[PDB]
Coordinates of C-alpha atoms and ligand atoms in Angstrom, one line a residue:
Chain D
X1 CA -6.6 28.3 -1.5
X2 CA -3.5 26.4 -2.8
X3 CA -0.9 28.5 -1.0
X4 CA -1.5 28.9 2.2
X5 CA -0.7 26.7 5.3
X6 CA 1.1 23.6 4.2
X7 CA 2.9 25.9 1.8
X8 CA 3.5 28.5 4.5
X9 CA 5.1 26.0 6.9
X10 CA 7.2 24.6 4.0
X11 CA 8.6 27.9 2.9
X12 CA 7.8 30.5 5.6
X13 CA 9.1 28.8 8.7
Chain K
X1 CA 26.8 11.5 3.2
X2 CA 27.4 8.0 4.4
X3 CA 24.5 5.7 5.6
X4 CA 25.5 6.2 9.2
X5 CA 25.5 10.0 8.8
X6 CA 22.1 9.8 7.2
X7 CA 20.8 7.6 10.0
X8 CA 22.3 9.9 12.5
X9 CA 20.7 12.9 10.8
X10 CA 17.2 11.2 10.9
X11 CA 17.7 10.4 14.6
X12 CA 18.3 14.1 15.4
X13 CA 15.3 15.1 13.2
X14 CA 13.0 12.9 15.2
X15 CA 10.2 15.2 16.3
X16 CA 9.5 15.4 20.0
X17 CA 6.2 13.8 21.1
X18 CA 3.1 16.0 21.2
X19 CA 1.5 15.9 24.6
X20 CA -2.3 15.6 24.8
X21 CA -4.4 14.4 27.6
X22 CA -7.4 12.0 27.6
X23 CA -10.6 13.7 28.4
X24 CA -11.8 13.5 32.0
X25 CA -14.7 11.1 31.6
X26 CA -15.1 8.0 29.4
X27 CA -14.7 8.9 25.7
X28 CA -17.8 9.8 23.6
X29 CA -17.8 9.7 19.8
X30 CA -17.2 13.4 19.7
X31 CA -14.5 13.6 22.4
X32 CA -12.5 10.8 20.9
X33 CA -12.4 12.4 17.4
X34 CA -11.6 15.8 19.0
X35 CA -8.7 14.2 20.7
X36 CA -7.4 12.3 17.7
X37 CA -7.7 15.3 15.4
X38 CA -6.2 17.8 17.8
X39 CA -3.2 15.5 18.1
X40 CA -2.9 15.0 14.4
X41 CA -3.1 18.7 13.8
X42 CA -0.2 19.5 16.1
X43 CA 1.9 16.5 14.9
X44 CA 1.4 17.7 11.3
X45 CA 3.2 21.0 12.1
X46 CA 6.2 19.0 13.4
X47 CA 6.0 16.6 10.5
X48 CA 6.7 19.5 8.1
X49 CA 9.8 20.5 10.1
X50 CA 10.9 16.9 10.2
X51 CA 10.6 16.4 6.4
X52 CA 12.8 19.5 5.8
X53 CA 15.6 17.8 7.8
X54 CA 15.5 14.8 5.5
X55 CA 18.6 15.0 3.3
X56 CA 17.8 16.5 -0.1
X57 CA 14.1 17.0 0.6
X58 CA 14.4 20.8 0.5
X59 CA 16.3 20.3 -2.8
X60 CA 13.1 18.8 -4.4
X61 CA 10.7 21.3 -6.1
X62 CA 8.1 22.9 -3.8
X63 CA 5.3 21.2 -5.7
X64 CA 6.9 17.7 -5.2
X65 CA 7.5 18.4 -1.5
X66 CA 3.8 19.3 -1.2
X67 CA 2.6 16.3 -3.2
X68 CA 4.7 13.9 -1.2
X69 CA 3.4 15.3 2.1
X70 CA -0.2 15.4 1.0
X71 CA 0.1 11.8 0.0
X72 CA 1.8 10.3 3.0
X73 CA 1.0 12.3 6.1
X74 CA -1.5 9.8 7.6
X75 CA 0.9 6.9 6.9
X76 CA 3.7 8.8 8.7
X77 CA 1.4 9.7 11.6
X78 CA 0.4 6.0 11.9
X79 CA 3.9 4.7 11.5
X80 CA 4.8 6.9 14.5
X81 CA 1.8 5.7 16.4
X82 CA 2.7 2.0 15.9
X83 CA 6.3 2.6 17.0
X84 CA 5.2 4.3 20.2
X85 CA 2.9 1.3 20.8
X86 CA 5.5 -1.3 20.0
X87 CA 6.1 -2.3 23.6
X88 CA 2.4 -2.4 24.6
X89 CA 0.3 -5.1 23.0
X90 CA -3.4 -4.5 22.8
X91 CA -2.7 -0.8 23.4
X92 CA -2.3 2.3 21.1
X93 CA 0.0 4.9 22.6
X94 CA -1.2 8.1 20.8
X95 CA 0.5 10.2 23.5
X96 CA 1.9 9.7 27.0
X97 CA -1.5 10.6 28.6
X98 CA -3.6 9.2 25.7
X99 CA -3.3 5.5 25.8
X100 CA -6.3 3.9 24.0
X101 CA -7.6 0.4 24.6
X102 CA -8.9 -1.5 21.5
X103 CA -12.3 -1.6 23.2
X104 CA -12.5 2.2 23.5
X105 CA -12.5 2.1 19.7
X106 CA -16.2 1.1 20.1
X107 CA -17.5 4.6 20.7
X108 CA -16.6 5.8 17.2
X109 CA -18.5 4.1 14.3
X110 CA -16.0 2.3 12.1
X111 CA -12.8 3.3 13.7
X112 CA -12.6 0.0 15.5
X113 CA -11.6 -1.5 12.2
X114 CA -8.8 1.0 11.9
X115 CA -7.5 0.3 15.4
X116 CA -7.3 -3.4 14.5
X117 CA -5.2 -3.2 11.4
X118 CA -2.9 -0.8 13.3
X119 CA -2.7 -3.2 16.3
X120 CA -2.1 -6.1 13.9
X121 CA 0.7 -4.3 12.1
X122 CA 2.2 -3.2 15.4
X123 CA 2.2 -6.9 16.5
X124 CA 4.1 -7.7 13.4
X125 CA 6.7 -5.1 13.9
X126 CA 6.9 -6.4 17.5
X127 CA 7.3 -10.0 16.2
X128 CA 10.2 -8.8 14.0
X129 CA 11.6 -6.8 16.9
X130 CA 11.8 -3.6 14.8
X131 CA 14.7 -1.5 16.0
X132 CA 14.9 2.3 16.5
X133 CA 17.3 3.0 13.6
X134 CA 15.3 0.6 11.4
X135 CA 12.2 2.5 12.2
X136 CA 13.8 5.9 11.4
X137 CA 14.8 4.7 7.9
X138 CA 11.3 3.2 7.3
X139 CA 9.4 6.3 8.2
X140 CA 11.6 8.4 5.9
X141 CA 11.1 5.8 3.2
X142 CA 7.3 6.1 3.5
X143 CA 7.6 9.9 2.8
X144 CA 10.0 9.5 -0.1
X145 CA 8.1 6.5 -1.6
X146 CA 4.7 8.2 -1.6
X147 CA 5.3 9.3 -5.2
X148 CA 1.5 8.9 -5.4
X149 CA 14.5 18.0 -12.3
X150 CA 13.5 16.5 -9.0
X151 CA 11.8 13.2 -9.9
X152 CA 15.3 11.9 -10.5
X153 CA 16.5 13.6 -7.4
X154 CA 13.7 11.9 -5.5
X155 CA 14.7 8.4 -6.7
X156 CA 18.2 9.1 -5.5
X157 CA 17.0 10.3 -2.1
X158 CA 15.0 7.1 -1.7
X159 CA 17.9 4.9 -2.6
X160 CA 20.0 6.8 -0.1
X161 CA 17.6 6.0 2.7
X162 CA 17.2 2.4 1.4
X163 CA 21.0 2.1 1.6
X164 CA 20.9 3.4 5.1
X165 CA 18.3 0.8 6.1
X166 CA 20.4 -1.9 4.5
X167 CA 23.3 -0.6 6.5
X168 CA 21.4 -0.7 9.8
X169 CA 20.3 -4.3 9.2
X170 CA 23.8 -5.3 8.3
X171 CA 25.0 -3.9 11.7
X172 CA 22.8 -6.4 13.5
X173 CA 25.2 -9.2 12.6
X174 CA 22.8 -11.7 11.0
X175 CA 23.8 -13.8 8.0
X176 CA 23.6 -12.2 4.5
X177 CA 20.5 -14.3 3.6
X178 CA 18.8 -13.3 6.9
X179 CA 19.5 -9.6 6.2
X180 CA 17.7 -10.0 2.8
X181 CA 14.8 -11.8 4.4
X182 CA 14.5 -9.1 7.2
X183 CA 14.7 -6.3 4.7
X184 CA 11.8 -8.0 2.9
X185 CA 9.7 -8.7 6.0
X186 CA 10.0 -5.1 7.1
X187 CA 9.1 -3.6 3.7
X188 CA 6.2 -5.9 3.0
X189 CA 4.5 -4.1 5.9
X190 CA 4.5 -0.7 4.1
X191 CA 1.5 -2.0 2.0
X192 CA -0.4 -2.5 5.3
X193 CA 0.5 1.0 6.4
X194 CA -0.7 2.5 3.1
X195 CA -4.0 0.6 3.4
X196 CA -4.5 1.8 7.0
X197 CA -3.8 5.3 5.9
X198 CA -6.5 5.0 3.2
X199 CA -9.1 3.8 5.7
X200 CA -8.1 6.5 8.1
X201 CA -8.5 9.3 5.6
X202 CA -11.7 7.9 4.3
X203 CA -12.9 7.7 7.9
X204 CA -11.9 11.2 8.9
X205 CA -13.4 12.7 5.8
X206 CA -16.6 10.9 6.8
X207 CA -16.6 12.1 10.4
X208 CA -16.1 15.6 9.0
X209 CA -19.1 15.3 6.6
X210 CA -21.1 13.9 9.5
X211 CA -20.2 17.0 11.5
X212 CA -19.0 14.6 14.3
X213 CA -15.8 16.6 14.7
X214 CA -14.5 19.9 13.2
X215 CA -11.7 19.6 10.6
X216 CA -10.3 22.8 9.3
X217 CA -7.0 24.5 8.5
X218 CA -3.9 22.5 8.1
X219 CA -5.5 19.1 8.9
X220 CA -8.2 19.9 6.3
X221 CA -5.7 21.0 3.6
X222 CA -3.9 17.7 4.1
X223 CA -7.2 15.8 4.0
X224 CA -8.4 17.4 0.8
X225 CA -4.9 17.0 -0.5
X226 CA -5.4 19.7 -3.2
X227 CA -3.5 22.9 -2.3
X228 CA -1.9 21.4 -5.4
Chain C
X1 CA 11.2 -27.4 -2.3
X2 CA 14.1 -25.2 -3.4
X3 CA 13.4 -21.6 -4.3
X4 CA 13.9 -22.5 -8.0
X5 CA 11.2 -25.2 -8.1
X6 CA 8.8 -23.1 -6.0
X7 CA 9.2 -20.5 -8.8
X8 CA 8.6 -23.2 -11.4
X9 CA 5.4 -24.1 -9.6
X10 CA 4.3 -20.4 -9.8
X11 CA 5.1 -20.3 -13.6
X12 CA 2.9 -23.4 -13.9
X13 CA 0.1 -21.6 -12.0
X14 CA 0.0 -18.7 -14.4
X15 CA -3.5 -18.1 -15.7
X16 CA -4.1 -18.3 -19.5
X17 CA -4.1 -15.1 -21.6
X18 CA -7.6 -13.7 -21.7
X19 CA -9.3 -11.8 -24.5
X20 CA -12.5 -9.7 -24.6
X21 CA -13.5 -10.4 -28.2
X22 CA -13.1 -7.3 -30.4
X23 CA -12.7 -3.9 -28.7
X24 CA -15.1 -2.6 -31.3
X25 CA -16.8 0.8 -31.2
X26 CA -14.2 3.4 -30.8
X27 CA -14.1 3.4 -27.2
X28 CA -16.8 5.4 -25.7
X29 CA -17.5 5.7 -21.9
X30 CA -20.1 2.9 -21.7
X31 CA -18.2 0.4 -23.9
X32 CA -14.9 1.1 -22.1
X33 CA -16.2 0.3 -18.6
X34 CA -18.3 -2.6 -19.9
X35 CA -15.1 -3.9 -21.5
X36 CA -13.0 -3.5 -18.3
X37 CA -15.5 -5.1 -16.0
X38 CA -16.2 -7.9 -18.5
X39 CA -12.4 -8.7 -18.6
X40 CA -12.0 -8.4 -14.8
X41 CA -14.8 -10.9 -14.4
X42 CA -13.2 -13.4 -16.7
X43 CA -9.8 -12.9 -15.0
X44 CA -11.2 -13.4 -11.5
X45 CA -12.3 -16.9 -12.5
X46 CA -8.8 -17.7 -13.7
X47 CA -7.4 -16.0 -10.6
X48 CA -9.1 -18.5 -8.4
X49 CA -7.5 -21.5 -10.2
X50 CA -4.2 -19.7 -10.0
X51 CA -4.4 -19.3 -6.2
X52 CA -5.2 -23.0 -5.8
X53 CA -2.1 -23.9 -7.9
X54 CA 0.2 -22.2 -5.4
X55 CA 1.7 -24.9 -3.1
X56 CA -0.1 -24.9 0.3
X57 CA -2.8 -22.4 -0.6
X58 CA -5.6 -25.0 -0.6
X59 CA -4.2 -26.2 2.7
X60 CA -5.2 -22.9 4.3
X61 CA -8.6 -22.9 6.0
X62 CA -11.5 -22.1 3.7
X63 CA -12.0 -18.9 5.7
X64 CA -8.5 -17.7 5.0
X65 CA -8.5 -18.6 1.2
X66 CA -11.6 -16.5 0.9
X67 CA -10.4 -13.5 2.9
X68 CA -7.1 -13.4 1.1
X69 CA -8.6 -13.4 -2.4
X70 CA -11.4 -10.9 -1.4
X71 CA -8.8 -8.3 -0.3
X72 CA -6.1 -8.7 -3.0
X73 CA -8.0 -9.3 -6.2
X74 CA -7.9 -5.8 -7.7
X75 CA -4.2 -5.5 -6.8
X76 CA -3.4 -8.9 -8.4
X77 CA -5.5 -7.8 -11.5
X78 CA -3.5 -4.6 -11.7
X79 CA -0.1 -6.3 -11.1
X80 CA -1.0 -8.5 -14.1
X81 CA -1.9 -5.4 -16.1
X82 CA 1.5 -3.9 -15.4
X83 CA 3.5 -6.9 -16.4
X84 CA 1.7 -7.0 -19.7
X85 CA 2.3 -3.3 -20.3
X86 CA 5.9 -3.3 -19.3
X87 CA 7.1 -3.3 -22.9
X88 CA 4.6 -0.8 -24.3
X89 CA 5.3 2.6 -22.9
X90 CA 2.2 4.9 -22.7
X91 CA -0.1 1.9 -23.0
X92 CA -2.1 -0.3 -20.7
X93 CA -2.4 -3.7 -22.2
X94 CA -5.6 -4.9 -20.5
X95 CA -5.8 -7.5 -23.3
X96 CA -4.8 -7.9 -27.0
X97 CA -8.2 -6.5 -28.0
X98 CA -8.2 -4.0 -25.1
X99 CA -5.4 -1.6 -25.3
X100 CA -6.1 1.8 -23.8
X101 CA -4.7 5.3 -24.2
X102 CA -4.4 7.8 -21.4
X103 CA -6.5 10.1 -23.7
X104 CA -9.1 7.4 -23.9
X105 CA -9.2 7.3 -20.1
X106 CA -10.3 11.0 -20.3
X107 CA -13.7 9.7 -21.5
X108 CA -14.6 8.3 -18.0
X109 CA -14.5 10.7 -15.1
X110 CA -12.1 9.6 -12.4
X111 CA -10.3 7.0 -14.6
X112 CA -7.5 9.3 -15.8
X113 CA -6.3 9.4 -12.2
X114 CA -6.3 5.6 -12.1
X115 CA -4.6 5.2 -15.5
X116 CA -1.8 7.6 -14.6
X117 CA -1.2 5.8 -11.4
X118 CA -1.0 2.5 -13.3
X119 CA 1.2 3.9 -16.1
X120 CA 3.6 5.5 -13.6
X121 CA 4.0 2.2 -11.6
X122 CA 4.4 0.3 -14.9
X123 CA 6.9 2.8 -16.0
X124 CA 8.8 2.2 -12.7
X125 CA 8.9 -1.5 -13.2
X126 CA 10.1 -0.9 -16.7
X127 CA 13.0 1.2 -15.4
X128 CA 13.9 -1.5 -13.0
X129 CA 13.7 -4.0 -15.9
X130 CA 11.4 -6.3 -13.9
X131 CA 12.0 -9.9 -14.9
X132 CA 9.3 -12.5 -15.5
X133 CA 10.3 -14.6 -12.5
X134 CA 10.3 -11.5 -10.2
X135 CA 6.8 -10.7 -11.5
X136 CA 5.7 -14.2 -10.5
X137 CA 7.0 -14.0 -6.9
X138 CA 5.7 -10.4 -6.5
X139 CA 2.2 -11.4 -7.7
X140 CA 2.2 -14.4 -5.4
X141 CA 3.4 -12.2 -2.5
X142 CA 0.5 -9.8 -3.1
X143 CA -2.0 -12.6 -2.5
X144 CA -0.3 -13.9 0.6
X145 CA 0.6 -10.6 2.2
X146 CA -2.9 -9.1 1.9
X147 CA -3.7 -10.2 5.5
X148 CA -4.9 -6.9 7.1
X149 CA -3.1 -24.2 12.6
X150 CA -3.9 -22.0 9.7
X151 CA -2.3 -18.6 10.5
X152 CA 1.1 -20.3 10.8
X153 CA 0.6 -22.0 7.5
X154 CA 0.2 -18.6 5.7
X155 CA 3.3 -17.1 7.3
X156 CA 5.1 -20.2 6.2
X157 CA 4.1 -19.9 2.6
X158 CA 4.6 -16.1 2.6
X159 CA 8.2 -16.8 3.8
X160 CA 8.7 -19.3 1.0
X161 CA 7.6 -16.9 -1.8
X162 CA 9.8 -14.2 -0.2
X163 CA 12.8 -16.6 -0.1
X164 CA 12.1 -17.3 -3.8
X165 CA 12.2 -13.7 -4.8
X166 CA 15.5 -13.1 -2.9
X167 CA 16.8 -16.2 -4.8
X168 CA 15.7 -14.8 -8.2
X169 CA 17.5 -11.6 -7.5
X170 CA 20.6 -13.5 -6.6
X171 CA 20.8 -15.3 -9.9
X172 CA 21.0 -11.9 -11.7
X173 CA 24.5 -12.0 -10.5
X174 CA 24.6 -8.3 -9.5
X175 CA 26.4 -6.8 -6.5
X176 CA 25.2 -7.8 -3.1
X177 CA 24.4 -4.2 -2.2
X178 CA 22.6 -3.9 -5.5
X179 CA 20.6 -7.0 -4.8
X180 CA 19.4 -5.6 -1.5
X181 CA 18.6 -2.3 -3.3
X182 CA 16.7 -4.0 -6.1
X183 CA 14.7 -6.1 -3.5
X184 CA 13.7 -2.9 -1.6
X185 CA 12.8 -1.1 -4.9
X186 CA 10.5 -3.9 -6.0
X187 CA 8.8 -4.2 -2.7
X188 CA 8.2 -0.5 -2.2
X189 CA 6.1 -0.6 -5.3
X190 CA 3.6 -2.9 -3.7
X191 CA 2.4 0.3 -1.8
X192 CA 1.7 1.8 -5.2
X193 CA -0.3 -1.2 -6.4
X194 CA -2.3 -1.3 -3.1
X195 CA -3.0 2.4 -3.6
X196 CA -4.1 2.3 -7.2
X197 CA -6.2 -0.8 -6.3
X198 CA -8.0 1.1 -3.6
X199 CA -8.8 3.8 -6.1
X200 CA -10.0 1.4 -8.7
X201 CA -12.3 -0.3 -6.2
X202 CA -13.8 3.0 -5.1
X203 CA -14.4 4.0 -8.7
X204 CA -15.9 0.6 -9.5
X205 CA -18.2 0.6 -6.5
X206 CA -19.6 4.0 -7.5
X207 CA -20.1 2.6 -11.0
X208 CA -22.0 -0.4 -9.6
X209 CA -24.3 1.8 -7.6
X210 CA -25.2 3.8 -10.7
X211 CA -25.8 0.6 -12.6
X212 CA -23.5 2.0 -15.4
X213 CA -21.9 -1.4 -16.1
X214 CA -23.6 -4.7 -16.7
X215 CA -24.1 -7.0 -13.7
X216 CA -21.2 -9.4 -13.3
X217 CA -21.9 -12.2 -10.8
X218 CA -18.3 -13.1 -9.7
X219 CA -17.0 -9.5 -9.9
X220 CA -20.1 -8.2 -8.1
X221 CA -19.4 -10.6 -5.3
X222 CA -15.7 -9.8 -5.0
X223 CA -16.5 -6.1 -5.0
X224 CA -19.3 -6.2 -2.4
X225 CA -17.5 -8.5 0.0
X226 CA -14.3 -6.5 0.0
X227 CA -15.8 -3.3 1.3
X228 CA -17.9 -4.9 4.1
Chain Y
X1 CA -17.8 -13.1 3.7
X2 CA -19.0 -16.2 1.7
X3 CA -22.1 -17.1 -0.3
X4 CA -21.2 -19.0 -3.0
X5 CA -19.5 -18.0 -6.3
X6 CA -16.0 -17.5 -4.9
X7 CA -16.5 -20.5 -2.6
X8 CA -17.7 -22.9 -5.2
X9 CA -14.8 -22.1 -7.4
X10 CA -12.5 -22.7 -4.5
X11 CA -14.0 -26.2 -3.9
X12 CA -14.2 -27.5 -7.5
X13 CA -11.9 -28.1 -10.5
Ligands
789_1 O1 -6.2 11.4 13.1 C1 -6.4 10.1 13.2 C2 -5.4 9.1 13.7 C3 -4.0 9.4 14.2 C4 -3.8 10.5 15.1 C5 -2.4 10.7 15.6 C6 -1.4 9.8 15.3 O2 -0.1 10.0 15.7 C7 -1.6 8.7 14.4 C8 -2.9 8.5 13.9 C9 -6.1 7.9 13.6 BR1 -5.5 6.1 14.0 C10 -7.4 8.2 13.0 C11 -8.4 7.2 12.7 C12 -9.7 7.7 12.1 C13 -9.8 9.1 11.9 O3 -11.0 9.5 11.4 C14 -8.8 10.0 12.2 C15 -7.6 9.5 12.8
789_2 O1 -12.1 -3.6 -13.7 C1 -11.4 -2.6 -13.7 C2 -9.9 -2.6 -14.0 C3 -9.0 -3.8 -14.4 C4 -9.5 -4.8 -15.3 C5 -8.7 -5.9 -15.6 C6 -7.3 -5.9 -15.2 O2 -6.5 -6.9 -15.5 C7 -6.8 -4.9 -14.3 C8 -7.7 -3.8 -14.0 C9 -9.5 -1.2 -13.8 BR1 -7.8 -0.4 -14.0 C10 -10.7 -0.5 -13.4 C11 -10.9 0.9 -13.1 C12 -12.1 1.4 -12.7 C13 -13.3 0.5 -12.6 O3 -14.5 1.0 -12.3 C14 -13.1 -0.9 -12.9 C15 -11.8 -1.4 -13.3

């Protein structure tokens, strides 16, 4: 935890 | 990037409204929280996309982008809620098919207090006749001001949006003194939004611990506010 | 009453400087908190006199005077802390005999978070080169804008203090665009004060429940009432 | 929320 979904939406999408 | 272009850019970045429907029967404590959290969850996804369209936001460091979003999300959600409710006194337009009456806030322990400061603030924005462009600037300011090398880049981004707001008020045509006074009246309300956000997050955390409604994934990460 | 003389009346309302009598005992966890609460209590007494010295405050209904002070007291206390610390980077000047280091805030669990918030906001006012007269209007505005025959009296007074701050910024002689920018920058910081205040209250309440700090009559009352 | 400490200070000099 600390990289996933907020971070995913911010850098992955 | 002139103030008008920034304003125009925010206008385009406005996320479309999330559609959610009121449950069939009168709300119960559980059904109201399920509704409010399901809506918040979906709006959060769009909020992330919206933020990336704010000039210079993607130029900040990832960690700052995260900190800013973890700090202001509920305020942004509520600022959006009040705007949607601007033309409906005594009502909170969470979604086209989810219009809550202040009295419906009686089925959830302690949320009635939240609904009241939101309705009060909305009435204030209504009193001042907040305008669409003003609203766009203010919501962006909330995100960039939630500071609760980029730091320097952040300050510059907030001043850019502030300049834009100043520019919008100037286009209204009121005297220079009245522009200053309006800028002040609008911004004095941010404190109220921050306070409502605090009660909202304390409340939601409580409903989660109470097992009154499930809270997981993205909504949860935001709630805990510690992915970093 | 011109903006200028309204500001003079605020200067005249200023509470006296308060000391805690020797910050003895290198600061440990118990002595630090006992010192902070002891000071808060003394300041609260002076805060009441200060509020009454603001033109029109005592004219508000007794119900309003009470609710305004019960909600803003921690914010006002912190706004005062920042003005006193503005010329001492890295330090929080709670009082001449109470000067605390960020490292000394490590002693108490949860305090470092509060101190950093306070130091950062203080650092911001320092950058802006906050002036003494601006501080006076801002503090006054905090009290009058903490509102989450008499209702109209409040808005009237709030408008007067706002008009005073706009005036103060006008005397600095800077650009008109820069005056608006400065105004917005100052006001956006109220969000940060309200935020740090909510955190201090939460930490203080927890401390009360554990009976970790001596019982302070006035402070206990201000704390209890606020939450309820 | 009254009771008295805050109130008595508001009504005395
Ligand atoms: O999620 C929550 C919202 C909300 C939802 C969507 C939106 O657009 C704006 C605010 C509120 Br009011 C609220 C109050 C108490 C809670 O425990 C959770 C929420
Ligand atoms: O009383 C408290 C103060 C304070 C005292 C005097 C002042 O002028 C400004 C703030 C802080 Br910070 C604080 C943090 C946590 C607490 O549990 C109690 C206090």
